[PDB]
Structure formats: structure tokens, C-alpha cells
Amino acid sequence: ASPQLQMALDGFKMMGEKMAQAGGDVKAMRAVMEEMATFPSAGETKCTPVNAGGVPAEWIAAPGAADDRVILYLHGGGYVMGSITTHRETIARLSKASGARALALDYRLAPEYPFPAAVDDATAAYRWLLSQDIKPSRIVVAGDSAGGGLVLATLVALRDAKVPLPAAGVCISPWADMEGTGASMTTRAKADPVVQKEMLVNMGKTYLGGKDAKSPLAAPLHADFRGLPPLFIQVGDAETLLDDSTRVAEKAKMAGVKVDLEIWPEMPHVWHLFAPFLPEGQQAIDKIGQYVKQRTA
Amino acid sequence: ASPQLQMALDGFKMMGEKMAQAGGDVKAMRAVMEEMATFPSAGETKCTPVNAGGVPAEWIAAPGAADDRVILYLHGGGYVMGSITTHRETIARLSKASGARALALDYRLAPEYPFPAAVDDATAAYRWLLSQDIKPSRIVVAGDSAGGGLVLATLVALRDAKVPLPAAGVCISPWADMEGTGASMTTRAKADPVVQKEMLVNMGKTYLGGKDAKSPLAAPLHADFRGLPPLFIQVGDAETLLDDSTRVAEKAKMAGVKVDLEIWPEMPHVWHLFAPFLPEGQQAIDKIGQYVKQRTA
């Protein structure tokens, strides 16, 4: 609302500053994000670890979510950090709001497993879902920041490989440009308390392992969008990644894709994560909820 | 349990500044507290307005909560502000954690309705509960800050009037001493982001109506405690009101009252109010749940 928004902004502002303090050290960075993670929904949420075609994963089901309606969820963390643990609360709420069971992927991360390890797990995971006899028309592939990028990458890979595509793709504050050439990397630098050009390019370099920064599957800004299923893109105005969402939305419509873009005024990066006390976070999760139903009916 | 406590502390520090910038403007102050309050539990909580013996009130029942087991909840806000609206969330979490239906009072506030109106509403609300065939052994009277105070005053007044007493009383960071004479007004003044002596003595004066500050039903540190039911007192170590709790716990013990005092390290004033994201918030509420449950078996 705003004393709520201002809690969340100082929230990231502190996350943002412990980030800097970890330096290049990736164990530290991982701990900064894991320390912010709580799971207040745990008590009423069913969690079942599972191997998703060789990808460590977890079924996350809010009460009376359908077995046969499925979100394949791809967590953010710059392709170097995050885990089922950091995003578990958001996924549970998306499950509730959508009446769908989530498969939350623990996909391999950089520097240990650089690009395209993440993409191969996502695709492996999706192909596993089809193997379990879940209809493609009952699945949506959803993710935030890096994982929002990985949603586009994944759909592109799947379409290349000629695998039945899913009912839609949901991108929260997606990261699609590895070089940070977006206008918003300057016009939203003041407003954004955590994502900045330098730290993001550095995280990109780590993901790429010296491979080409314009590789479609790593930087889906530069990917071919023709034939992808409907895309839902939520992004905040107070985001250096605003123009990853604006440019992807423009390019996909031009390619004939059905896109819905929401630019949430004053909201910061993956504001969904502050859902428990930030009304906009839960509002944004309820909109995704409805989208998944109107797409999987 | 620290990136979260730091968000909470910043929360209070923002609130404390908005308090100071209303001056003594009571309309404005009442707006600061409404600003900060949300009700994320609303969707699963049954809320029923009611007149409680000529006191505007609300039944608030979490799922599972029983009709015949009740918390008379008495909200904080220094006897001048707060409402059912400010404390709805904390009250619904106390409802779920305790498996008890709660009655939230919009008790009358100074300076429109100075001391003793709050105490007359409280006791009027209590006797009404009894008129509705709710057994006193199935009642707990619970309150935070000013409302913590009001729990003590209410049990004193009820005992003096020979009204059959409830199973227990619960005081969260209770305000017992109108003159702020405790060691913690000096030893915890740096640590506590929200309660300072000056602002609080001056807020007592508003409640008192120039009546005596040692007045037992206004300052229950000075009340006789002999006869009162069991008390649960929870207070933060990072609180100027810490010694209100320790002093009240020592007097009460000495007067034969079965008293359970918990000092919570680093925690600030009514840290419960941050339960949605602050884990020690929800823990503190979970304990009150267990206390109410064991005291009403």
C-alpha cells in the first residue's frame, strides 16, 4: 500500500546491500537470499520431494489443488542462487490462487553448472510432466527474474524440439537481456532498491561461462517467439528490468504470440515475494491465479 | 529472525516518526496506526459485528475455533487509538492458534471517553459474555500494550465486584505504570524503536483526564492482585515497558497469582503485530494459543 511498500523497499535495500558485502563469494550470496526466506503457509501446504526426469524437484499443493492442473515453477536468483526453499511461500500461494499443484524445480546453477544446464533441466522437467500423463493444455510454465527468462528459453527449446507446448507461460519481472541494454537500466536505477546493471551483468557472465551474451536460450530477448503459447508478463515500474518485459512483450506480439503485459506502478522486483504483508504482492499472485485457470479450462 | 526483525524494527521507526509528526493530533495519530494495519487472514476468517452489552464489538473466528471457548481481546494503542481494524490480523491468528472464538472490543478511547470508560466497556463486555452462557472457565481475557493494562484493570474490577473470574489473563508488552518509572525507560530507550517515556507519560495524561496517575484501574502496577486468575505475560527485551512486565510479574507472584512470564530477546513492542513475516511474532502467538488451550481444557 505504502508503509507496506516502504517496508518491502527497505527489505530489498538491505538484501541489496548484504549482496554487495558477499562480493564475488557465491556461498555467501546464496545465504543472503536463504536468510530472507520464510514459509508461513507451510502448515496447510502439502510438499512432496520428487525426481522430475533427473531434476531434483518438489510437488507443492495448496489445499484442493488439482493433480491434473500443474504449474512448472522456475525460481529466480540470477541463475547463480535461489532454491525451492527461497520461493516455496510464493509457489504455495500461486498454487492456492490457481487451484493447481506446482512442480518447483531445483535446477542446476552457475558457476558449478553454467548455461545451458538450467534450460536442459527445465525441458527435462517438462518432458517428465508429459510422461506422467498431465495434458500440455493443463500446464503453465511460470518463473521469476532469471526463472522468468528460463520460462521463455524453455518454451523456445520445446518448440524447436517439436514437443507439445503448454497452455501458457507466466513471467514475473523476467531477466531476458544478459548485457543490460534496456533504457530502464538508467531511467529506473534510482527507483529500484536491488537490481542494478553492474551486479546483473556480472551474474550473467557467471551463467554464460564465457559463451556468447546474445545466445537465444540464455538471453531470450534475442530468441525467436513464433508459435509460443500465450504469455502473461507482470513487471514493476520501479525495476531496471522493466525494459526486458516491455521489449519481450513487443517482440512476441510482432511474432504473433498472444501477450498480456501488466506494469505495476511503484512495485519493485518480484514484489510477489512480500505477499504475506504487501497487498500488491497477493493481488499480483491472485491475477496469475486467474490467468492459469482461464488458460487451463 | 533478523533480516525480518530488522524489517519490523524499521517498521516501528517509520511508525514512531509518523507518530511524532502528528504531535498530539489524535485524529492524525489514529490514521498512522490504520495505515500500518492489513488483514491478510481475512479470506479464511469469519467476522461478525455485535453489540457486547452496549460496547461495539466483533466476533473473529479462525477455521477450527469453537463457539464455547472465547478470548475477550482488548487492543493496544495507549488508550487513545487502535481499533478492531488495527488488531484484526493478530486476533485471527490468536483465534487459529488457540482454537477459540475471539470477541474484539472497540472500547471507548480518550480524550472523548477518558479513564475509566475503557474499564467499564471491558467489564460490560465480560458480563455480556456470561449472559450468553459462555462459562468463565472457557474465557481468557487477552490484550496488548494499553490493552495489556486493561486486562489487569478488568480482572481487578471483576474480582472487586464478585463477578466469577475467567480461566486466565494474557498481557502482551502490557502498559501497567502511567508515570514510566521502570529501569527499562533508561536501559532499553536506545533499543526500543517506538515506546519512549515523554510521548507515553503525555499519552497517559490524555487517558487519565487529570485524575491520579497511581489510580489502580488506570495503572494496574498499583492494583491489589490477590484473587486474580492465572496470568500469561509476554514482553520484548528491546522494550521501555520491559519492567512494567517484570514488576507486574513480581507483585502478582507475591500475591499468590499463578504467573508465567516470557522475556523474548531482541524483540520490540507487540512484535506479534509483525507475525505475517516475523517468525518470532507467529511463535509468540502459537504459545498464547497453547496457553489459552491448556487453561480452558
Numbering used by the authors:
A (entry chain AAA), B (entry chain BBB): 2 to 298
Q: What text appears in the publication on this structure?
A:
Est8 is the first member of the family of bacterial hormone‐sensitive lipases (bHSLs) for which promiscuous acyltransferase activity in water has been reported. Certain hydrolases preferentially catalyze acyl transfer over hydrolysis in an aqueous environment. Herein, we provide evidence that acyltransferase activity in esterases highly correlates with the hydrophobicity of the substrate‐binding pocket.
We observed that its substrate‐binding pocket consists of a well‐defined tunnel, which leads from the protein surface to the active site harboring a catalytic triad (Ser146, Glu240, His270). As typical for bHSLs, the cap domain forms the most significant part of the substrate‐binding pocket of Est8. In contrast to the conserved C‐terminal catalytic domain, the cap domain is highly variable. As discussed for CpLIP2, CAL‐A, and MsAcT, we assumed that active‐site hydrophobicity also plays a role for the acyltransferase activity of Est8. On the way to reaching its thermodynamic equilibrium, the reaction is rapidly quenched by acidification, thus indicating high hydrolase activity. For most of them, the relative activity quickly dropped already at low alcohol concentrations, thus suggesting low stability. While Est8 and the homologues described above maintain their activity for over a month, purified WP007 precipitates within minutes after purification, resulting in a complete loss of activity.
